[PDB]
Design a protein around this motif. Sequence first.
Motif, PDB file in Angstrom:
ATOM      1  N   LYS A  37       0.747  -0.860   0.027  1.00 55.09           N
ATOM      2  CA  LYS A  37      -0.135  -0.072   0.039  1.00 55.09           C
ATOM      3  C   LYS A  37       0.812   1.374   0.125  1.00 55.09           C
ATOM      4  O   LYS A  37       0.629   2.339   0.800  1.00 55.09           O
ATOM      5  N   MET A  38       1.857   1.287  -0.862  1.00 54.93           N
ATOM      6  CA  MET A  38       2.896   2.283  -0.764  1.00 54.93           C
ATOM      7  C   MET A  38       3.335   2.827  -2.283  1.00 54.93           C
ATOM      8  O   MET A  38       3.196   1.780  -3.368  1.00 54.93           O
ATOM      9  N   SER A  39       3.483   4.079  -2.513  1.00 55.90           N
ATOM     10  CA  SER A  39       3.916   4.543  -4.010  1.00 55.90           C
ATOM     11  C   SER A  39       5.151   3.773  -4.073  1.00 55.90           C
ATOM     12  O   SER A  39       5.983   3.180  -3.265  1.00 55.90           O
ATOM     13  N   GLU A  40       5.566   3.698  -5.460  1.00 55.06           N
ATOM     14  CA  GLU A  40       6.544   2.853  -5.857  1.00 55.06           C
ATOM     15  C   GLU A  40       8.074   3.612  -5.642  1.00 55.06           C
ATOM     16  O   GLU A  40       9.132   3.012  -5.390  1.00 55.06           O
ATOM     17  N   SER A  41       8.012   4.837  -5.337  1.00 58.15           N
ATOM     18  CA  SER A  41       9.328   5.724  -4.857  1.00 58.15           C
ATOM     19  C   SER A  41       9.506   5.236  -3.308  1.00 58.15           C
ATOM     20  O   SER A  41      10.832   4.991  -3.114  1.00 58.15           O
ATOM     21  N   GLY A  42       8.578   5.438  -2.423  1.00 59.91           N
ATOM     22  CA  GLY A  42       8.576   4.818  -1.163  1.00 59.91           C
ATOM     23  C   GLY A  42       9.248   3.383  -1.222  1.00 59.91           C
ATOM     24  O   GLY A  42       9.995   3.101  -0.115  1.00 59.91           O
ATOM     25  N   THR A  48      10.047  20.152   6.928  1.00 61.17           N
ATOM     26  CA  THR A  48       9.899  20.079   5.550  1.00 61.17           C
ATOM     27  C   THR A  48      10.743  18.653   4.976  1.00 61.17           C
ATOM     28  O   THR A  48       9.925  17.816   4.196  1.00 61.17           O
ATOM     29  N   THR A  49      11.713  18.083   5.578  1.00 60.80           N
ATOM     30  CA  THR A  49      12.283  16.915   5.319  1.00 60.80           C
ATOM     31  C   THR A  49      11.499  15.712   5.557  1.00 60.80           C
ATOM     32  O   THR A  49      11.177  14.645   4.894  1.00 60.80           O
ATOM     33  N   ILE A  50      10.969  15.787   6.729  1.00 57.60           N
ATOM     34  CA  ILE A  50       9.882  14.880   7.296  1.00 57.60           C
ATOM     35  C   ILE A  50       8.558  14.658   6.501  1.00 57.60           C
ATOM     36  O   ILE A  50       8.278  13.457   6.166  1.00 57.60           O
ATOM     37  N   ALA A  51       8.050  15.805   6.135  1.00 58.27           N
ATOM     38  CA  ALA A  51       6.918  15.799   5.346  1.00 58.27           C
ATOM     39  C   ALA A  51       7.099  14.993   4.013  1.00 58.27           C
ATOM     40  O   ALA A  51       6.016  14.217   3.678  1.00 58.27           O
ATOM     41  N   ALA A  52       8.253  15.187   3.293  1.00 55.86           N
ATOM     42  CA  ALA A  52       8.567  14.458   2.276  1.00 55.86           C
ATOM     43  C   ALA A  52       8.476  12.961   2.511  1.00 55.86           C
ATOM     44  O   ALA A  52       7.625  12.297   1.551  1.00 55.86           O
ATOM     45  N   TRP A  53       9.122  12.682   3.633  1.00 57.57           N
ATOM     46  CA  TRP A  53       9.104  11.211   3.869  1.00 57.57           C
ATOM     47  C   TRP A  53       7.793  10.519   4.095  1.00 57.57           C
ATOM     48  O   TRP A  53       7.483   9.468   3.775  1.00 57.57           O
ATOM     49  N   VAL A  54       7.056  11.349   4.709  1.00 51.76           N
ATOM     50  CA  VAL A  54       5.517  10.995   5.104  1.00 51.76           C
ATOM     51  C   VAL A  54       5.016  10.531   3.779  1.00 51.76           C
ATOM     52  O   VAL A  54       4.287   9.311   3.351  1.00 51.76           O
ATOM     53  N   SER A  55       5.232  11.516   2.872  1.00 47.63           N
ATOM     54  CA  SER A  55       4.577  11.393   1.271  1.00 47.63           C
ATOM     55  C   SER A  55       5.185  10.136   0.795  1.00 47.63           C
ATOM     56  O   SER A  55       4.220   9.123   0.048  1.00 47.63           O
ATOM     57  N   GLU A  56       6.362   9.848   0.694  1.00 52.64           N
ATOM     58  CA  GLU A  56       6.914   8.753   0.056  1.00 52.64           C
ATOM     59  C   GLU A  56       6.365   7.411   0.876  1.00 52.64           C
ATOM     60  O   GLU A  56       6.140   6.428   0.236  1.00 52.64           O
ATOM     61  N   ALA A  92       3.421   7.384   2.493  1.00 52.22           N
ATOM     62  CA  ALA A  92       2.021   7.218   2.272  1.00 52.22           C
ATOM     63  C   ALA A  92       1.156   6.170   2.112  1.00 52.22           C
ATOM     64  O   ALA A  92       1.669   5.372   1.431  1.00 52.22           O
ATOM     65  N   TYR A  93      -0.042   5.908   2.783  1.00 55.13           N
ATOM     66  CA  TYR A  93      -0.833   4.661   2.508  1.00 55.13           C
ATOM     67  C   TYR A  93      -1.496   5.080   1.281  1.00 55.13           C
ATOM     68  O   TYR A  93      -2.317   5.853   0.671  1.00 55.13           O
ATOM     69  N   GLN A  94      -1.060   4.182   0.033  1.00 54.58           N
ATOM     70  CA  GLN A  94      -1.554   4.039  -1.165  1.00 54.58           C
ATOM     71  C   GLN A  94      -2.977   3.187  -1.280  1.00 54.58           C
ATOM     72  O   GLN A  94      -2.924   1.900  -1.124  1.00 54.58           O
ATOM     73  N   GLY A  95      -4.262   3.975  -1.296  1.00 51.52           N
ATOM     74  CA  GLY A  95      -5.260   2.818  -1.169  1.00 51.52           C
ATOM     75  C   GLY A  95      -5.610   2.377  -2.454  1.00 51.52           C
ATOM     76  O   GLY A  95      -4.704   2.609  -3.461  1.00 51.52           O
ATOM     77  N   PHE A  96      -7.017   1.942  -2.704  1.00 54.25           N
ATOM     78  CA  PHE A  96      -7.429   1.124  -3.864  1.00 54.25           C
ATOM     79  C   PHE A  96      -7.313   2.299  -4.983  1.00 54.25           C
ATOM     80  O   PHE A  96      -7.665   3.551  -4.650  1.00 54.25           O
ATOM     81  N   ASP A  97      -7.013   1.736  -6.301  1.00 55.77           N
ATOM     82  CA  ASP A  97      -7.009   3.000  -7.444  1.00 55.77           C
ATOM     83  C   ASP A  97      -7.454   2.284  -8.571  1.00 55.77           C
ATOM     84  O   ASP A  97      -6.632   1.565  -9.285  1.00 55.77           O
ATOM     85  N   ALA A  98      -8.856   2.416  -8.842  1.00 53.83           N
ATOM     86  CA  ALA A  98      -9.414   1.782 -10.115  1.00 53.83           C
ATOM     87  C   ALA A  98      -8.806   2.034 -11.420  1.00 53.83           C
ATOM     88  O   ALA A  98      -8.714   1.344 -12.143  1.00 53.83           O
ATOM     89  N   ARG A  99      -7.988   3.185 -11.572  1.00 57.35           N
ATOM     90  CA  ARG A  99      -7.290   3.643 -12.760  1.00 57.35           C
ATOM     91  C   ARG A  99      -6.102   2.683 -13.003  1.00 57.35           C
ATOM     92  O   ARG A  99      -5.867   2.062 -14.071  1.00 57.35           O
TER      93      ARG A  99
END
Lengths: 243, 243, 243, 243
Positions: A73-78, C18-26, C28-35
Amino acid sequence: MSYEEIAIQFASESVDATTIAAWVSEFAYQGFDARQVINLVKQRGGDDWKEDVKKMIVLSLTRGNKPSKMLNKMSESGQKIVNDLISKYKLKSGNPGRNDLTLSRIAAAFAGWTCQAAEVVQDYLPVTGRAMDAISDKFPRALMHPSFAGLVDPTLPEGVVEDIVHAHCLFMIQFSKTINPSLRSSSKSEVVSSFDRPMQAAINSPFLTAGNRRDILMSLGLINSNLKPSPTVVAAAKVYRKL
Amino acid sequence: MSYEEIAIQFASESVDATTIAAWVSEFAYQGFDARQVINLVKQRGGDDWKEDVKKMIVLSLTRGNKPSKMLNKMSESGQKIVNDLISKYKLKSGNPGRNDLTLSRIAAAFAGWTCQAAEVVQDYLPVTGRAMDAISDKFPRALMHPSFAGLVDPTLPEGVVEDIVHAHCLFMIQFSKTINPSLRSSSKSEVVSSFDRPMQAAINSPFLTAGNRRDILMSLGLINSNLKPSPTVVAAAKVYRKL
Amino acid sequence: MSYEEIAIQFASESVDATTIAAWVSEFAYQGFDARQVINLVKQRGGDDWKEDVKKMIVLSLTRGNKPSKMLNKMSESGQKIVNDLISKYKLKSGNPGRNDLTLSRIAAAFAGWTCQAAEVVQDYLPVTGRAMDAISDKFPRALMHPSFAGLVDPTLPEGVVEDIVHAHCLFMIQFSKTINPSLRSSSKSEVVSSFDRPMQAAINSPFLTAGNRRDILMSLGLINSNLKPSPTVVAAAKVYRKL
Amino acid sequence: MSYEEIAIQFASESVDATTIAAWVSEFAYQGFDARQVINLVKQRGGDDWKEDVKKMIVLSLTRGNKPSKMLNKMSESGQKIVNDLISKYKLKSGNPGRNDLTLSRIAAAFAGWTCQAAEVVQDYLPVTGRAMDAISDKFPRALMHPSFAGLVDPTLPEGVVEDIVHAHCLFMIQFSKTINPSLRSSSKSEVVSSFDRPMQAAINSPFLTAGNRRDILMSLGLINSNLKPSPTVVAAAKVYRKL
């Protein structure tokens, strides 16, 4: 000699207390040891270990202690980052031996940092800062992680230790429920049973001296230099006590 | 011939009681057999087997019946010993066949020794001697292990058997709860259901004659030579009976 | 430098937001994506993918989300088809990563079709159309699958959204119970807890615009062109509300 | 074409009832089929298959449906036999596909014999004949196995079917509890829920005609040639009905 005789005679064999005591020592339960986590981290991490530790702790705070289930459940960069930490540090999940690392263990060994980071990533914690605000307003984020337990100075005036623990317990209730839905209906004495053993172990652990723990609590704003806890911490302790 | 006809005719096939009885015997449940444990221990252990058995029993008393999960919380010197016992004796966990050894089985086969060792390692038992003292004072340590059941002489005056069993049951309640937290709220009839079947099996087992079991109970100080149980054992039986 | 000092100093290390925010993004939980489901389906399915998708959706509707356990109770002709879909689409079960397909995911990505098919295969659904009729008469079959949630237009008049959701919730109660017998005695607030999180996620998902979702609801006969829900949908919402 | 458009258009794709109906058939649930068990037994067993079947059924009656877990508590002579049946018949445990055999399936396919054998091995059944006698006296042993369900003639006078089923249900209650301790405290409607679906399936199964089933019931002494059930069967039905 029948099996019976062999068993009877064996009941007459020596029971030497001195030799047995030594065996118990060899066989003794070896619990969590922050020193060994730091060792493994340093050995495996090379020169960039501190940055790695911070990444792993932010990882723990936002995604928990299962690094492989995390990848689903993670982006590919993560995933490039997490897979790299897993390999470099030989990351495991759950509860393995004394030569294995886990996000939880690492977060615990470096609790003083873990608890500042929780303030930064509060909106992405299992139980959120705002979620706690609803229970007790302006709830101190530094409390919002299990590793905080190791930062408690137990030599403090008993009234103050009690306020700090109780305030942390209030968070641990929400947390423990959020992590185990099997408890979301359980009694408060029951939920607390699910974390108070390792909590007490860290409060009374010989890792970090009283002075060390106290100094960290002052830096976090949890107590002032005169040993008086934040109003915000006393507040949360009240709410916990109305159990 | 349709499948139907085949099934109908099969219902008319012979049901010979003699041939079937033999099959039931071949297929019969083969329970715990102390003689076979002793066999396997002797074969695999060579000349130093007795010392090995004592080590394995102290291991069981303090760390339970899962020798591999045990290694994940053990000093490195202890692990050299435990891994060596595991290899030499082909140690398994849980409940395998008649040609496999376990700490529990070994502890049971040599119950007369197991129960003296429990007195020595009482502060390191799942349920501690002091913990029992709180329930019934000066609680007899020789009772504090499941293998004790095999030491009960059932030909004793019924009143005495009853006191010995009941006192042991009081320990088995704490023990069974400590090992299965799923029971820590269960009723007393429920907890007792979780150990009374194998307990009765060992009480009425043909391994160790009545005289043998009785002689061991006298050595342990559980009964005097006049068949009268320790005050301390009667005491604990009272507490159990106020269920 | 002792382990203690190392841990103390680490608590003084930078905590850069700032650096931590980026890490959280990396991280981050990636949920269901119909695409991404549609992507994987198109890549793996070649030219005949649409027909394959319909087969897989009918499969999901009648036999659930475990394609291998499914083979153990299937005619041999069916197995040739299912094994072929499994291989072609690398079908998994349960909850794997972002590069894996499941019947459930596929059914969800193509919800607008899934919900028309449920009307056709209604007698072979875990909870049947007639079964629902007993709870609320002429219960709208288009509602009878979890993927329906993604078809809800939340910009609709709140009263109408509420009727559509509530009617679907009534089905989700029977469904959720049928799939988890552990709930067949649970309270209605409890059962609803078992599906309302992902339900809300799909209602408020950015996949399919409001207009798109609305257009599909009109095609299904769930609302007329004047935004008024079927009597049959209001009916079921009443029954749900008498909780 | 965006993923959105692709999903919208897909909702306008054909939903042909005829083509879908065929797919449902291919994907249909294939339940227990006694004919296929008999097939597999005959193919794999060669000429001595009938004797093998009887051995396997006596095995099932006394030791259950897990043939490998069974070996861990069996004499060494028994193991030569069981391992040989396992190999010859490719024995599995639990619930595999249509080309696999299990003790339970074999016992079910040959129910008419299974239920006579249960009378012979009654003292070695999970729930014993005497155990049932305590609940209802002289309880008919032919009822004491789940496979009996397939021997019920449902075209019988409804009052009689009802007595036979209810009497069997009383056994199924003890049985179902003995096999699942999780039910030993459950309500009677709850226990019955744990076996009544497959019971009804076998009662109304097209394997063995009404006449066939009826003829077997007369041989077992369950009903006389005038369709009147044993007093002993009516008796047990009474006890069941005082639920």
